[PDB]
Every structure is written in C-alpha cells, then in structure tokens.
Design a protein around this ligand. Structure first.
Ligand code: 4MP
Ligand code: FWD
Ligand code: FWD
Lengths: 260, 260
C-alpha cells in the first residue's frame, strides 16, 4: 500500500485553512466538512492519505481546443492525484472520464440576494435588467446555464454571457463579497449548499430565495479503473446510513451558525 | 442484441395498470413515472425491452437463513431480469450484490398522518402510545429502523417490532388505507416520494408532517457485470441534466393533483 494523494479545493466550509495553519503540518493544516469526510473514508477503506490543494484552484472542465482537463478532474485524469474529496458535482461529461461514488451530499443551483433585494425567483431575474447577476466563472453552475434549453435559464445565459462589466466571479467568496457590496444591484447564482452556509455567517446580510433550479449531488471521484473506487463507494453509503453525513453537515453549517 | 427484461413493481405513481389494461398488450398495459423513464432509458441506450412485474411483489431483501434474495433485487441476482427500473432505494447491502446507476430521484423516510392528528415529528411519535405507527413490512424503510442506532428511531423500532396487532403493512396502499380508516389512531412512516403523491390524491385527508428522517435516492439496478450498467448510468445523468426527470415528476405528482 502507498499513501493516497487526495486532491481537494479551498471552499468554505468544506476545506479551510485553520487559523494557525502556519504552526501546523500535513493534513493538520486543514479543517472542514471534506477534511472530516476524508478521514472517515480513509478509515473505512483502510488507507493512509495526504491532503493537497488543487494546483490551479479549479473544479474541472475540458478546454474545447486543447481537450485538456483542468482542476481536480484534471489532476485525476492525468494521475497527479488518486482521489478527489470535495464539493465536486457529478455530471455526465465528468462521468465519462472519471468515476464518481454515489452522492454524499445533495444540492441545486440557487439564488443569493442581499437582504431586501426585490427578487424571488430566476424568472424575476430574467425579466429585469436593473439588478445584475452571475455565477462562478467556471464549474457546473456556469455550464448549466450555457447548456440549458429551458426558456428562463436560456434567457439568463444570453444576458450573463455578454453582460459588462463581467458578472462571472473567480471564487464563491468573490461572488458573496460582490452581493454584499453592491447594495442589492447584484444577485448571485450558486450551489444551494454554499448559499445555505453563507446565510448563517456574519454580517447575516444575505439570503437564499426561491426554489433550487435543479437537483443533483457531490460525489467522491477517482480515476477510471482505480482500485479505490468500489471501497470508497461502499464507504459513502455506509456513512450515509449511519447518519454520519447528516451529522457532519450540521456540524459545519448550523451547529455554529452566526445568525441566531 | 436481445430484448431486455425489465423488472419493476406495481407502486403508484411509478407503475400502474391502465384503466383498460385488459384490452391492451405488452408494455402498453402499464403507465407511470417508471414506465416513462424506462422508455427514455431504452431510447438513449438503444435497446428494446419488455416490462414485467416482479413475481413476489417485493423490492429486495436477503433471508438471513437461506441467504436467498427476494423481490426485484433477487430477480437481478439470479438472472431472471436484466434491469430493474422502479423506486428501488440505493443501499449498501444491495450495492454489494447488484449495481446501481446514480440516483434518478431523491427521497427520505417521512411521516404521513390523517389530517388533524396531533403529531409533528418522529420524536412526537416515540414519546406517546395512543397513536400507533408502522412501516411497509419489507423494504429499506423497515431496515432503517431495525438498524438505526439513533435514540429516537431505535425507540420507535423497539415499539414497532413488538406492537400488536402488527403495525407493518404489505403495501403502500394498505398503509394509506389504515391511516385513512383509523380516525387518527395510526400514523404511517413511508418514503417522502410516495407520501407527497398521496397528499395530492382524493379524498385529500392525509398530510406529510415534519422533516425527512434521512436523505437518499432511487437508482436503476443491473446485475453486477452487466453490459448495460455504464450506458444506463450515463443516460440517467443526461436525463437529469436535460430537466426530463423533473418534468416527469411534475407530470405524475403535481400536474394532475386532485387536491387543489
Ligand atoms: C443525499 O441523497 C441524494 C443526493 C443527490 C441525489 C441526486 O443525485 N439527485 C439527482 C436528481 C435528483 C436527486 O436527488 C440523490 C440523493
Ligand atoms: N461544485 C461545482 C463548482 N461550483 C461551486 C460553487 F460554489 C458554485 O456556486 N458553482 C459551481 O459550479 C463543480 O463541481 O464544478
Ligand atoms: N423503496 C424501498 C421500498 N419502500 C417503499 C415505500 F413506499 C416505503 O414507504 N418504504 C420502503 O421501504 C426499497 O427499495 O426497499
């Protein structure tokens, strides 16, 4: 057996640097839902591991011209990492190049607004131009709008793709900051899981509105043909059935909520 | 290529006999969410199929003594069917003997009450004895309580396993009938999906209360090593991403709701 190289991404509250990470080493430098999940998965599958933060800080997309995969998906595809344990959305294009465990968490694209913003749905956003809106610059959310044939979402994509200044952001933190500093003139489309987390964070000035636009899940990913695939999948199912995944979500989302 | 034998189960609104099934033949005799799903899956995977109703009318469990698997899982395990397209819950014990596609529908165990029943949660049920409660006699819901280490659910299991007369029912329809005819003295624990469907059916006298006890999903199942596994999994992801699964749920659950 060899130490398993785990690729993941800095995204709250999945993986975050501990306040005093400078005084720590190895896996101890990080904390979060996926850090806890990695420990449980490794324990149940019987392997030693090393957490690493994805080099380019991306989730995973294929360049239409070079055909090269970036982000965590890329690290798995090219063998730079053995497994990805992060909020990586299970999608068809990814399932074609890597393997996914059954989902360990549910989510859907949602709307985040600065409290008081006169928006209640995606339809509302699409029917007005006063309030700008966008998504994470790369990832499954952006692709959802790019590919959607649903009238409302296609109308939103047409606006976002040519809006200026750009409505796309590099990170969730940037999207949240933009919502918080735009006096209600910017709304952010992001995964419900991140939205729900931020809503319970000071200064408690954001809120999730409307229902989710879709329904999907995050899965643990391995390179196709990996000897870890089967065990990891069974571990996810066992952890869900034992109520551990629900326990972990409450721990990182609500137990220490900062908004009452 | 050979005609694919699909095993499924009579469970509303997944698979139901058309009103005039007697005048129809083959797959045309049935209608429902899973009937529509089977057609879409077959279309995308390029295969011809024959719908069959599981012989013993069960979902799938292993006898602790004979080690024999019954229900739809059994039909796959022993090669009597090539694929199962029904509301079959993805569980660890099943994943060990058959393969599951990524989930095509989300669900969680929930509580169904006759309107007016003074119950709002599982905790409420566990802390009283006036109102009896049970689950489907066999399936993942019963197993959830049998295996749960969570205090409230373990307390509920202890009561249900020895309650008399028996609180377990043979079919969902029987559980619903019992709730409807027990004047509020019986509450039924069942999958949220079925609960949500029944709530919009006349005589509109039942309702879902409290949050779900767990979070999981239904998956399409194939015998381990099946040449259909990969294609079927990709088909499920494609159908979800195209919004077809959401369209199908609205079609069979809400579009024709009977309660306003
Ligand atoms: C936590 O349990 C689950 C998380 C995610 C999923 C899932 O992948 N999907 C896809 C379409 C609807 C749905 O729920 C199913 C169950
Ligand atoms: N999970 C996504 C990445 N990702 C993350 C977010 F927080 C969000 O709002 N949108 C998104 O696409 C993926 O796997 O690409
Ligand atoms: N989906 C389950 C079967 N099943 C169905 C129900 F409607 C219910 O309430 N409980 C249950 O276990 C399985 O796969 O065993």
């Amino acid at each position: 057996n060899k130490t398993v190289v785990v690729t993941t991404i800095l995204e709250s509250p999945y993986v975050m640097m501990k306040k005093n990470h400078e005084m720590l080493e190895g896996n101890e430098r990080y904390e979060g839902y996926c850090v806890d999940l990695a420990a449980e998965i490794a324990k149940h599958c019987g392997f030693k591991y090393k957490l690493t933060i994805v080099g380019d800080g991306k989730y995973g997309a294929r360049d239409a011209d070079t055909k090269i995969w970036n982000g965590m998906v890329g690290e798995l595809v090219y063998g730079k990492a053995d497994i990805a344990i992060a909020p990586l959305t299970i999608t068809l294009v990814r399932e074609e190049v890597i393997d996914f465990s059954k989902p360990f968490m549910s989510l859907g694209i949602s709307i985040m607004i600065k409290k008081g913003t006169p928006i209640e749905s995606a339809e509302d956003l699409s029917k007005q131009t006063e309030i700008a809106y966008g998504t994470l610059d790369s990832g499954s959310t952006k692709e959802f709008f790019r590919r959607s044939k649903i009238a409302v979402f296609d109308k939103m994509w047409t606006y976002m793709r040519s809006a200026e200044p750009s409505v796309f952001v590099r990170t969730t933190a940037e999207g949240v900051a933009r919502v918080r500093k735009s006096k209600g003139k910017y709304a952010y489309l992001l995964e419900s899981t991140m939205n729900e987390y931020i809503e319970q964070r000071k200064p408690c000035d954001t809120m999730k509105v409307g229902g989710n636009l879709d329904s999907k899940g995050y899965g643990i990913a391995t390179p196709k043909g990996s000897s870890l695939g089967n065990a990891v999948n069974l571990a996810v199912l066992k952890l869900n059935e034992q109520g551990l995944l629900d326990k972990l979500k409450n721990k990182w989302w609500y137990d220490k909520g900062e908004c009452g």
